[PDB]
Design a binder for these strands. Sequence first.
RNA 1: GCCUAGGAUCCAC
RNA 2: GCGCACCGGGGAUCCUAGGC
Length: 1498
Amino acid sequence: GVESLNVLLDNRSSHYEEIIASCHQGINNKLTAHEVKLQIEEEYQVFRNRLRKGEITGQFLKVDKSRLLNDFNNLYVDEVTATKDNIEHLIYQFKRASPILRFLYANIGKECQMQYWRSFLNKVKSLRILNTRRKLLLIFDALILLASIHDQTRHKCSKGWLGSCFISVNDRLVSLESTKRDLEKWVGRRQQSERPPDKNQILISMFQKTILKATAALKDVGISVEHYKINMEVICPDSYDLILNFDVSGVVPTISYQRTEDEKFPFIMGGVELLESTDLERLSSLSLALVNSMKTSSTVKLRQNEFGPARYQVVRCKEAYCQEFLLSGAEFQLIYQKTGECSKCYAINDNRVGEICSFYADPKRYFPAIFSAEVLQTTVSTMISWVKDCSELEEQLCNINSLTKMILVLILAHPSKRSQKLLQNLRYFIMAYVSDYHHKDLIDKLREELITDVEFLLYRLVRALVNLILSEDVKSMMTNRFKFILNISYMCHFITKETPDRLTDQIKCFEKFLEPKLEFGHVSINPADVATEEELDDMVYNAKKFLSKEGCTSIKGPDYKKPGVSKRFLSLLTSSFNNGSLFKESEVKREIKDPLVLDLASNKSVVVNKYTDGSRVLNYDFNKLTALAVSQLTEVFSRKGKHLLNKQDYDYKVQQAMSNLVLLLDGGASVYFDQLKETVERIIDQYRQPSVNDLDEVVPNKFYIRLIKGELSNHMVEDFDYDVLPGNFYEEFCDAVYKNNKLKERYFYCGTKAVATRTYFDQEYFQCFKSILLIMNANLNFKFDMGRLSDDVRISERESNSEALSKALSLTNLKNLCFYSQESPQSYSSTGPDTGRLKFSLSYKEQVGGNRELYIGDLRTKMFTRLIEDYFEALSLQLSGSCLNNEREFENAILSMKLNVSLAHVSYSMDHSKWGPMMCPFLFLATLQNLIFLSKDLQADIKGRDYLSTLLTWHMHKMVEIPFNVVSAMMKSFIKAQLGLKKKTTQSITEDFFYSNFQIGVVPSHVSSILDMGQGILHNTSDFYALISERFINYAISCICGGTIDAYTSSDDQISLFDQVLTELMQRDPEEFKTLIEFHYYMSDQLNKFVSPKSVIGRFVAEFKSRFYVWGDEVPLLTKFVAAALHNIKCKEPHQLAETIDTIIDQSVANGVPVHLCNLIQKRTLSLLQYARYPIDPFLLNCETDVRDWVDGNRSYRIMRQIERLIPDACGRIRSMLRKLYNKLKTGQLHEEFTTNYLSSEHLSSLSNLCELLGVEPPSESDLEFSWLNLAAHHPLRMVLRQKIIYEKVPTIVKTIQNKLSFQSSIASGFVGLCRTLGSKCVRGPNKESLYIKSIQSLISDIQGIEPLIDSHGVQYWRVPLNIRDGNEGVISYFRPLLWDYMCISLSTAIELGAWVLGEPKKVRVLEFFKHNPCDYFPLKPAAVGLNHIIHSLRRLYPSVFEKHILPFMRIKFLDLCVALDVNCEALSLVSHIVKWKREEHYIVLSSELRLSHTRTH
RNA sequence: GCCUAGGAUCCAC
RNA sequence: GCGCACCGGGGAUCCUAGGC
Ligand SMILES: [Mn+2]
């Protein structure tokens, strides 16, 4: 099902023929195996001659450790003017490098009424009851202050104060004097305006009105105020005088916005040792308060707190937000003034001092250190323990430890971007160090453009550590030190994957995308859907030029790192592929056959175009773009730049003129100014259905509308809470909507609207209400509509793959979506299909270091790309060598690399530079128009090649969309530079390219060139080309020398193992081996494969897709996995976060990470949950695992281990029964009596009957009472919206099958959302309700027979006697009989894994201690279904679920038992875990920890 | 400019 | 003390009516 082009018209006229005849000009794909050898010998002779003479550069250098170390030392010798640094001096100046670091190592160190009043007012404000219009927060602060006054007069509860400021309702920290003066002014002005009443009276009345309105609104939605233990006695008849006469003396908090001198730090600088963990604990608390600084709602402000430019100097705190955090003997307040995630200025303040240190920061970057105060210490301890027995270093081990700790603390404190590329490039350095040859242009690629002082200090520390490890007299254990330095390098993963700045990264990415095209020689700009003849001529010219490359037979010789491919070498490659020369013997037998003889359902944000007429828009509108740019600069100046400058400034007057235009003459700017004026005037004149505002047409009480909006924004429509509104309001709203003919016909079907009609007529008032909401839900004065303008300038629109795919499927009525459909093309042209030329859209992934760009096309583009991808994949599958998809080939490559390193043979661990942009679809078209697969069959191969040619032709003429952000930024920069503001006179090539089109009209929207291959688009075609070219290169090398090479590659990589011949050659004659490597480089360049300067040749290591291998030992990437586990949390249900962390940690332990650290990672995750006020269930995580629990067991085995650890002596009498039960089920006794009489029956009364059915003693009466609290027992928790989702008690297995058959937030924002959910009515009642977790805790504490129990790790489980099992069935419904769930899971694993798990576990205690070195590994294999196997076996035990859930989503003798044993489980994934996530089959563990893992004998 | 009544904004994005 | 494509981020009030 590939060839389907015969349904369309060809229309290939005089252009496709030209491109075809281009790649047949000077190419001879018929050379025999002898002419090819002769030409290769000639080329090699000429190359060796011209390399000895010196007409060609060296390009490779033999490794000299001394020279490499010297270059790394003098890598940054223009600012770091030094060579050797004293370790003590480095330590000394580390603890003073920055505010955060100064604070980390400094020498520092009641149930009152104010808390009640503050919580009450916070709840009142959260509901958005009272419209803040005239200093409402002022009387809020007045109430809080009165509460505090009464409180202190009672017993002097000196909390909630900061010397002279107190914490207000939301989070605000207001000063006493300022609010006192404000109350004075307000009472005075009010008394004057209303003038008889005393000031005390006029204040108490103002308090009473607000309190009365708040209490009345609260006693309307069942939030009765008696819950909050408030006391309205605090409103004393003598209060105003009590306030004005109250005064607390202390300090005044401050925030410093400028770089303060290093003497105002009120504590001793360095007292904390690096060995201790107190610095990590301080960083943990500070990072926690910094992430919490994002949960503050953006309330209005009372006072301006400063005036004029002094508002960016040292600023006193009269009204600012404040987050508290404690340090082990004291408390501190992180004070700030802005709310959100954007970068802002914080300041730490104490109670006995003020403004300890202020610093700018970005809150959503400090997550990796939240509770990892003991994980990181153990990481450093293990890394030090690696190189600990090296006798050349034992004299100065403490310095190595100090440097490692300092590097970690530093990268955690300041997670800057360019402080990550340094630690990344350290890997390439240490790789080239131990090798034998490397690229001469290496050091010029390790240099990162460092900026701040902290980055230079980090470089200094790294340099000291390197020169301490890789010395010239430490030739003891190179493998351990290599692994140590590699892990130090991989420490870069501890920073973040995110981007510090969106626009700057998206512009650097566009510069990377645009520069090579401009430097190549030609670029088409703003192409039309019907390509112009000149554009076709330029494409043909660029085509004929792309083959014009030459080298080593010319005057100038070769020119390296320039895109293109020589006709001679392309002809050699095609001929050698047609002569069977590039065919191993295991492939000439099975002759190569041409491959001509829901699926996209994802969340890739596929693109979709806009249509203004019959044609679609392909160019931004110049006038609209400049209008939007000016509209942006207006908000930038008014909202922000107002309190920044004076008014006599030229730039200020120009910006204010532009603002008045939206809301000089002697420089040539008045002309352009009036042009912009008339343009924006035309735009404003040109800019002069159901929705949310329809709620205004229905609900009279605006407060109810505010509640509805708050719900809709906090939670999705589906989990809308019932008790947020009065019951009668639902029916009233439904009636009022249905009566309004307009809204009735806009939301109901009188002929989803059908569902609204049904639910209304059925009197399902809440259902009708939620349906209506779902249909609906889907500052400065502007003289026009700003949002429609902003959304009209854009050209493309993103969405989900599934949405557009379903729309296309509905419009059809894989290949069925692009050829047989109502919106199908008729006559594909030369450029592209009849629909129009292919179109992509630039993006970029978030990758450590640099960021690769991802192309995104619309549906037709994705389909036509997938056709070529599948064709070339099925083609490459016949040939051996590629490892992009074939996992078996990758494992073979790993085995070959291991064998090669074991023999100390030469290994070339290559990599290619700019593989994406340099490759081009024309190259693939040329290399495809010359191969012949089927030597005999020459009938259908021609048709297949013609089809693939006509597809690659379209892919050649593709047009890439320039992102809207970068074009807007360039337009604003152009406007500014036209005004003359900030003349730079540099004008990088990108800016020149943009301006050259801006100042002549048209704006660059779509760019098309012959040069770029979509990075990640043709990922398999490029892989096939790389395979077929590397095979020819190795064939040439074998033809010249007398050795062989075995190469593996996945589309950008190369691991080339050399035979013994090449190794002994490099041993004897270094010159010949070097010129061979150089000729290999030359060849790879001649075929458009530019070897990257990050490639090495050595006999010590071998990397492939970041999988290093040394002799004997194996190198784990400890810090990589630890950093991947530290920040890997989301805003999801806790039993899913736990499963994700468990999978991550399993993958980790399968790669050499010790378990003593994985336990600490799990403890950190549990602490992160405990902080969010969530109870810990036994089915969450087992933080006491061993080695066996990851190699033998699986997800559900460590759970059994944990439960056994919780309740010993009770699970034993259950395994005793389970052994006999498994024996009976395996011999084939019943196999159905159990699966029906006990799996579809009661729980405990059935459990005792089941265990007495066999010949074992039933459990004691005081064992069935052990139960665990299962929140979400009726319905899963309602999660607060952190991502817009694109468009009964269902068992978890059913939802897993649904997921398989078919814009999120950052990590820190996700953790904030998680902490916001748990504590905001997340649980759901039996039928439909909402309760706080604390309310359920209270309801459980009421019953004086329920006993809680907690383990040392903090796992909760309860003891509920049997007499309480009834009567009060409102809460007991949430408990589950732990023992029975343990039995169920144990049985579900005993038939998943072997029957061993039912044995009696015993710890190996007869084993004495061995002298365990921290580096000696042990390889192990795990102790060893499908999708339709489950779905064809589920309609037998629960056919109603099929008829209800799984039907529209379209034999094993024991799967029918397991697939039902997990349905009634509803406690943990049992078969879902093996159907959704594949277990790894190769583990590398510590041979010392295996000595302590338990034994589970049958 | 100030005061009063009402309307708008008052998780993160 | 953030970002560091030299361009960004770093303090929230607004509207209608009436009275002085
Ligand atoms: Mn590689």
